[PDB]
Design an enzyme around this catalytic site. Structure first.
Site, mmCIF file in Angstrom:
data_model
loop_
_atom_site.group_PDB
_atom_site.id
_atom_site.type_symbol
_atom_site.label_atom_id
_atom_site.label_comp_id
_atom_site.label_asym_id
_atom_site.label_seq_id
_atom_site.Cartn_x
_atom_site.Cartn_y
_atom_site.Cartn_z
ATOM 1 N N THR A 119 8.776 -1.702 -2.664
ATOM 2 C CA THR A 119 9.873 -2.197 -1.841
ATOM 3 C C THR A 119 10.747 -1.051 -1.364
ATOM 4 O O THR A 119 11.096 -0.156 -2.145
ATOM 5 C CB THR A 119 10.721 -3.131 -2.679
ATOM 6 O OG1 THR A 119 9.925 -4.247 -3.055
ATOM 7 C CG2 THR A 119 11.962 -3.599 -1.921
ATOM 8 N N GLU A 152 4.739 7.228 -4.031
ATOM 9 C CA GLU A 152 4.346 7.440 -5.409
ATOM 10 C C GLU A 152 3.262 8.512 -5.482
ATOM 11 O O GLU A 152 2.229 8.409 -4.813
ATOM 12 C CB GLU A 152 3.883 6.117 -6.039
ATOM 13 C CG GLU A 152 5.054 5.235 -6.371
ATOM 14 C CD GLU A 152 4.685 3.852 -6.786
ATOM 15 O OE1 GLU A 152 3.610 3.374 -6.386
ATOM 16 O OE2 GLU A 152 5.519 3.225 -7.471
ATOM 17 N N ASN A 164 0.250 3.576 -10.842
ATOM 18 C CA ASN A 164 -0.076 2.188 -10.526
ATOM 19 C C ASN A 164 -1.123 1.508 -11.382
ATOM 20 O O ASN A 164 -1.230 0.274 -11.380
ATOM 21 C CB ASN A 164 -0.365 2.096 -9.035
ATOM 22 C CG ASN A 164 0.909 2.205 -8.250
ATOM 23 O OD1 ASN A 164 1.842 1.429 -8.507
ATOM 24 N ND2 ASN A 164 1.007 3.184 -7.374
#
Lengths: 213, 191
Positions: free
Chosen positions: A1, A87, A210
């Site tokens: 987000t 990331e 992740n």
């Protein structure tokens, strides 16, 4: 987000502020991608206090372009910082497409390139892989002539009218290792459309973060 | 066009006249600040865009409803760690409760308070923690306030993300400042 909160002391009503934000969003935040997953929570809010005490801003105001540019640059700067903090990223990637059928298609092509996992991993490996870039151009859904494409990586033109140029691979690799942002330029030679998109490289740490490693 | 636009590298959301900000640590995150607000001393014209994902977190609706009343806000309250997404009616109730408690805290109309969340999907907000936290928020018109707020909206981010540009309108110095977050699940499609 992603979230972004922008504040200004400009005097401007909500209607004209909204018109500006909607247009600017299409050229900034809606032109970034880290991993291709569109979140359930993304939102941007802009608040204008009016405490600068300027005459209320509209597109007819003589200094509108000053305000508009400030707001656009602020959103662009934040969008780029989001993309850079993808990331696991080590690099921001900026893609500029020119010569598209229109600006919308240039944007779609630019984003298709920066969102390609093969492009994103090539950049991590410092591989100036125009083959992966042109593949993404080709599946973008936009008007493309496969025989009239120019691709540059930094100042190095790797493909000219869809013919490889014999560029130095050591030079291209050296550029990819040191550049931030890495800049990819594409000319499709179709029309006058131009647009940019931003993303990041795909690295081992994307996976570690992740996959809970 | 009629005057340059200049970047202020040390500016942020508190660089614009009227605005204060803060972030605090409520304990939803282990160490980082996880609840914050930006507030304005006067009603501020407001605009927003929102994810077009058909699965949408409750607070996005609540914020839209606030802005729809007058197109004006005085507070933006944000928690991080928990998205308040896929939380159904209970999640919506929770977002309205955050808005009400924020309005009490800042002594302003509910419709001048926007709220949002970011973090884990499906988890319910710990409302005793959040509501007690909101009541403790003390915004300051300082760069430190802006940085504390930006920390309070991060999730997986490794760094804060600030911006500030200035220009001239009618001979007046106009400032645009901002903060952002985002690192994963990033492919915005907002309107």
């Amino acid at each position: 987000t992603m979230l972004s909160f922008v504040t200004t002391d400009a005097n401007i009503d909500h209607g004209h502020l909204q018109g500006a934000l909607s247009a600017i969003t299409n050229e900034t935040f809606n032109r970034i991608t880290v991993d291709g997953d569109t979140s359930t929570n993304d939102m941007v809010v802009v608040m204008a206090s009016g405490l600068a005490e300027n005459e209320t801003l509209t597109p007819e105001h003589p200094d509108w372009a000053n305000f508009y540019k400030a707001l656009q640059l602020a959103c662009e700067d934040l969008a780029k910082q989001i993309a850079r903090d993808g990331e696991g990223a080590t690099k921001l990637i900026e893609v500029e497409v020119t010569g598209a059928a229109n600006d919308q298609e240039a944007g779609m092509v630019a984003k298709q390139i920066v969102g390609s996992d093969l492009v994103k991993t090539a950049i991590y490996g410092a591989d100036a892989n125009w083959g992966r870039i042109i593949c993404a151009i080709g599946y973008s859904g936009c008007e493309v002539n496969q025989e009239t494409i120019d691709i540059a990586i930094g100042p190095i033109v790797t493909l000219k009218q869809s013919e490889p140029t014999g560029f130095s691979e050591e030079e291209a690799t050296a550029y990819l290792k040191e550049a931030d942002p890495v800049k990819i330029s594409v000319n499709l030679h179709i029309g006058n459309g131009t647009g940019k998109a931003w993303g990041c490289d795909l690295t081992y740490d994307y996976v570690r973060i992740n996959a809970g490693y | 066009e009629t005057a340059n636009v200049l970047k202020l590298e040390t500016g942020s959301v508190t660089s614009a006249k009227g605005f204060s900000a803060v972030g605090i640590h409520t304990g939803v995150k282990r160490k980082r600040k996880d609840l914050g607000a930006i507030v304005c001393e006067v009603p501020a014209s407001s605009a927003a865009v929102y994810t077009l994902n058909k699965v949408q977190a409750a607070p996005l609706k609540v914020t839209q409803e606030s802005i729809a009343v007058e197109g004006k806000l005085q507070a933006m309250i944000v928690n991080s760690g928990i998205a308040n997404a896929c939380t159904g009616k209970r999640g919506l109730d929770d977002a309205y409760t955050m808005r009400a408690v924020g309005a009490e805290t800042f002594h302003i109309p509910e419709h001048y308070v926007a709220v949002t969340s970011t973090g884990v999907i499906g988890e319910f907000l710990p409302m005793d923690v959040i509501t007690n936290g909101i009541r403790q928020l003390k915004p300051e018109a300082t760069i430190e306030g802006a940085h504390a707020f930006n920390e309070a909206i991060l999730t997986t981010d490794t760094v804060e993300k600030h911006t500030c540009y200035q220009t001239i309108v009618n001979g007046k110095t106009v400032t645009v400042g901002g903060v952002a977050k985002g690192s994963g699940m990033i492919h915005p499609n907002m309107a």
